[PDB]
Design a protein around this ligand. Structure first.
Ligand SMILES: O=C1C[C@@H](C(=O)O)NC(=O)N1
Ligand SMILES: O=C1C[C@@H](C(=O)O)NC(=O)N1
Ligand SMILES: [Zn+2]
Ligand SMILES: [Zn+2]
Ligand SMILES: [Zn+2]
Ligand SMILES: [Zn+2]
Ligand SMILES: [Zn+2]
Ligand SMILES: [Zn+2]
Ligand SMILES: [Zn+2]
Ligand SMILES: [Zn+2]
Ligand SMILES: [Zn+2]
Ligand SMILES: [Zn+2]
Ligand SMILES: [Zn+2]
Ligand SMILES: [Zn+2]
Ligand SMILES: [Zn+2]
Ligand SMILES: [Zn+2]
Lengths: 362, 362
């Protein structure tokens, strides 16, 4: 009694390559993706070095082509120095990512004028996504309107933010958004269990009312995306815990549990993990690609999922109903019951496929 | 300087097969589709006999497999006798079509209770589309809510209707809609030129204010679809003119003209003729399929387009900028510069592809 799903897409992951400090890399992070029923990922640019220029993108592309086990696209990151310099490589990236709240020096924008410059210079037909919390959502929406183009808001986490976006959509404004599983299945009530170190994430865990508001406003949510952000326990439990949770291996089991409980439908799930990612980012179909899941078996999330090198999870102890049994990627068995079966380098950059270019006028 | 588009989808066509009275059939109608840059069509069930039971669907499937030159899915039609009888074939159809205003005896529903019965018995995961004008839009939305499921509204044609749907979307209700080109590019102002016979269509041509309201509310429109409804001039100019316009060959040139004038973007067009049709009807990707268009050349729509056996067009005399140059369907050249190059029967029923089943829980 298995259910066949299409190849699912996670448009927001951090795979820590290039980089020398973290354990996760393209090979381990994409193994985690496959084990979570994900066959395409879009990787964020806050790596070391960050993907803020053409040489860094070229490096990252080759590392991903050699390490990735599922298909991928790579974001470019906006900086205080690169507006107007990315035109030649822009169409090879997933899109442009703006970090509008806290981030590292290289990705910090110090003025809304810098946001305007990116919206004015990035090619108008290509995706722009923003890390934009609370009032920053309204501020980036204003910049998008001043420049007459769309914006996608990453990880919406608060009642305030989803209601703002709801109001913008009611006015016909071209805004889309995504929500991460930790903002649907964790809240302040869980900070006692997690502790202040493990609980650190940006956007932070919301109140019960924030969580309730996201569920109530599911119609406003275009995509689910994990914001897979691996850090080891040594980091999360240390003196300056970095924010973020691993999430590729838990996202689909959590959401399938919600489907089984009637909190959203299977279609609602597949719009948000397949059809809307495709259409917002113009990501191409994957031929001969599907995921088989088992909805009959209940299990408890353990202290760590098998594949992510984060080697911890904030969902430990939650009971889920829903298991990824098999993934077929482009005609090859990629995952069966806890074993990944495609090697590093099987994955490809979808922006190089003929079907994966974003359409544009001449 | 050609622009590559993906395979475009028209979710609302009338191809008049099975039937003995009209000139159009699957072979000619799908030639018209290819010449308009369309590689997949969903055909409506108001044929002769109408597609209101399993034997009629089986017949229509074989006629389409033998005649179609592009890929297709076939709608089932709701009748006063078939609620609760279509479960075994439902997933093989594009969806279920309800004719809630004027139609022929066999498709006429005489009570809203019959609409409720169809919404209650048709499988909940499969598409339902309705011909629903003016207050009928609100009535079918109520039935959808009473039965806790979605509905798609065909050919929205009026300010009244698009504002109703806008209000429903603002309340989070699961409703989508489509608009046809004649309701964006023709109005009452054109009835003088067309005359009462040629001008007959359902929904009727709107006022200038209706047309303006649809453009102003483009964000509310999920899909464009032609409602290709071929009748010959002998019929349109006769004593009891049937309603409908041919439209497969004009829809894309008209919309590309609007893109060139900045009335909507290329992305706005491709969401409405590719990505949203896919996601609302769970229509599968077409491998190795694309359309090449030329945006440089201005031409005037003639008295009839080359392929549709309707052999007339209400857009005669309008100037357009945008031409379909080449269509490749599943690796084969299907159309080049006025010549269709795939024979009748090249097209396939997409609901038989592994990727073309609608996902459902066990
Ligand atoms: O904005 C971010 C980035 C991320 C990371 O660890 O890269 N982790 C977070 O919690 N928020
Ligand atoms: O509802 C319909 C059906 C159609 C036809 O000719 O089949 N033509 C129209 O104008 N309206
Ligand atoms: Zn972020
Ligand atoms: Zn994101
Ligand atoms: Zn992130
Ligand atoms: Zn870290
Ligand atoms: Zn696209
Ligand atoms: Zn099982
Ligand atoms: Zn493309
Ligand atoms: Zn109709
Ligand atoms: Zn329709
Ligand atoms: Zn129709
Ligand atoms: Zn006729
Ligand atoms: Zn689908
Ligand atoms: Zn030319
Ligand atoms: Zn399918």
């Amino acid at each position: 009694k298995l259910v066949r799903l299409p190849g699912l897409i996670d448009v927001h992951v951090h795979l820590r390559e290039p980089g020398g400090t973290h354990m996760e890399d393209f090979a381990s992070g994409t193994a985690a993706a496959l084990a979570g029923g994900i066959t395409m990922v879009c990787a964020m640019p806050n790596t070391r070095p960050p993907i803020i220029d053409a040489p860094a993108l070229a490096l990252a592309q080759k590392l991903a082509e050699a390490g990735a086990r599922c298909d991928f696209a790579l974001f470019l990151g906006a900086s205080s120095e690169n507006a107007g310099t990315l035109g030649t490589v822009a169409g090879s990236a997933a899109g442009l990512k703006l970090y509008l709240n806290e981030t590292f020096s290289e990705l910090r924008l110090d003025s809304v004028v810098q946001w305007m410059e990116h919206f004015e210079t990035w090619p108008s037909h290509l995706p722009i996504v923003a890390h934009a919390e609370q009032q920053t959502v309204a501020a980036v929406l204003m910049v998008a309107q001043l420049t007459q183009r769309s914006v996608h808001i990453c990880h919406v986490a608060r009642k305030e933010e989803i209601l703002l976006i709801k109001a913008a959509k009611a006015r016909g404004l071209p805004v889309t958004c995504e929500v991460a599983p930790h903002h649907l299945f964790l809240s302040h009530d869980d900070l006692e269990r997690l502790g202040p170190g493990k609980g650190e994430v940006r956007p932070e865990l919301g109140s019960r009312q924030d969580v309730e508001a996201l569920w109530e406003n599911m119609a406003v949510i275009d995509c689910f995306a994990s914001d897979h952000a691996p850090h080891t326990l040594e980091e999360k439990c240390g003196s300056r815990p970095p924010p973020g949770f691993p999430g590729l291996e838990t996202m689909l089991p959590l959401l399938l549990t919600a489907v089984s409980e009637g909190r959203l439908s299977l279609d609602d799930l597949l719009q948000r993990l397949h059809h809307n990612p495709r259409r917002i980012f113009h990501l191409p179909p994957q031929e001969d690609t599907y995921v088989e899941v088992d909805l009959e078996h209940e299990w408890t999330i353990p202290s760590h999922m098998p594949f992510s090198k984060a080697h911890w999870t904030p969902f430990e102890g939650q009971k889920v109903k829903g298991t990824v049994r098999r993934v077929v990627l482009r005609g090859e068995v990629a995952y069966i019951d806890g074993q990944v079966l495609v090697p590093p380098g099987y994955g490809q950059d979808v922006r190089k496929w003929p079907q994966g270019a974003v359409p544009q006028l001449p």
